[PDB]
């Protein structure tokens, strides 16, 4: 590389919210991030976050069976 | 009626009518043909009159293939002006046609019909004509 135009890369630890620490390289030695691949829903199996719904609708109301036959 | 949609030049020098046709001498699409026996500039109007008469003979039916095209612009000086002051205005378009050329073909029609339409068409053209039918000689070209 040409001298004097490039930000030096040094060993660098990125600290995610799941409490993961990544040993990589950056122009900054230590980084805090809110999320990473280790804890991200799309990555992590299929963590169905807040909606483990099973839809739930629409047949599935069931309040109830009390109308006569 | 037939004229170029566009051209590189508005007026063409006149040129000559020597020789037999360069190509276009064998039947190539239909069954019967009208071939030119003598050279001429065939005008767009003359062509259109041949065509119209042919469809008129068929009433409904047949296919007419027109094989000559009027791309030569024809120039004429305004009436009564003297010689000079530049070339005349384009007044129409012609197809240069030499002896041997198949100018028109017909298909999809009886023999007596193809003969007659081509004859009537012939009467619209300012040259002598020959009707022909497709041969093996045509097919081998």
């Amino acid at each position: 590389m040409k001298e004097g135009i490039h930000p030096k890369l040094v060993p660098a630890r990125i600290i995610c919210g799941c409490g993961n620490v990544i040993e990589t390289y950056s122009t900054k030695p230590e980084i805090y991030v809110e999320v990473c691949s280790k804890c991200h829903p799309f990555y992590t199996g299929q963590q169905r976050f807040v909606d483990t719904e099973g839809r739930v609708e629409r047949f599935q109301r069931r309040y109830g069976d009390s109308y006569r036959k | 009626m037939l004229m170029p949609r566009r051209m590189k030049y508005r007026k063409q020098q006149r040129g000559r009518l020597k020789g037999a046709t360069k190509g276009g001498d064998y039947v190539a699409f239909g069954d019967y043909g009208l071939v030119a026996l003598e050279p001429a500039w065939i005008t767009a109007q003359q062509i259109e009159a041949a065509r119209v008469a042919m469809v008129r003979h068929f009433r409904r039916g047949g296919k007419i293939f027109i094989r000559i095209f009027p791309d030569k612009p024809y120039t004429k000086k305004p009436l009564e002006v003297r010689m000079g002051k530049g070339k005349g205005n384009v007044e129409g378009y012609v197809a240069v046609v030499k002896p041997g050329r198949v100018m028109f073909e017909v298909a999809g029609v009886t023999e007596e019909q193809a003969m007659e339409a081509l004859r009537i068409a012939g009467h619209k053209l300012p040259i002598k004509t020959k009707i022909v039918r497709r041969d093996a000689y045509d097919e081998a070209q």
Partner: protein, 181 residues
């Protein structure tokens, strides 16, 4: 050369799995990363404030490498383009730096993408290369809210020695590129 986790992962985990999966007869036939070429189509700096030294800075923080300028091949009316105008950046990452970039793209950047539902399965070149676009540079661990004047995305070309898409999906997937379908 640097020991970087992803580089190692390639030699150790990915090389073999690939040879298994396609039965290569020669070590050089197995798919390699050639180059990652990052581009900023920009041109919001055409006349305006062609101080996109701010972006060149941002890009150089992300890659550890200073981009070079791209200028218009021809003049363009409707986009307002005088020929020779500075309208983009491009940084060609190779070797160690390419790996480091990807390492963090894969670990950190892509995760931070809004409503991320996986990389596009169909963005495959058809000769075994892959392309994907970002909308913002706040995706990278190095660029904080504090430092940015305005949201700008980028184009990422990842170039591979594989002859076919089918092989490239494999290399890129094994390496850890998350695909939606």
């Amino acid at each position: 050369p640097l020991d970087v986790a992803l580089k190692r992962k390639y030699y150790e985990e990915v090389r073999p799995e690939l040879i298994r999966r396609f039965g290569y007869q020669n070590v050089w036939e197995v798919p390699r990363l050639e180059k990652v070429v990052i581009n900023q189509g920009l041109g919001e700096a055409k006349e305006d404030a062609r101080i996109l030294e701010k972006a060149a800075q941002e890009l150089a923080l992300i890659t550890g490498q200073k981009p070079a300028v791209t200028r218009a091949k021809k003049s363009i009316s409707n986009f307002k383009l005088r020929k020779g105008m500075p309208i983009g950046l491009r940084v060609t990452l190779r070797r160690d730096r390419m790996w480091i970039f990807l390492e963090k793209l894969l670990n950190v950047a892509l995760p931070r993408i809004r409503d991320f539902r996986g990389l596009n399965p169909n963005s495959f070149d058809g000769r075994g290369n892959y392309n994907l676009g970002l909308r913002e540079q706040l995706i990278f661990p190095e660029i904080t809210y504090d430092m940015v004047d305005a949201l700008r995305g980028m184009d990422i070309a990842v170039v591979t020695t594989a002859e076919t898409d089918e092989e490239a999906r494999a290399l890129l997937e094994l390496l850890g590129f998350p695909f939606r379908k």
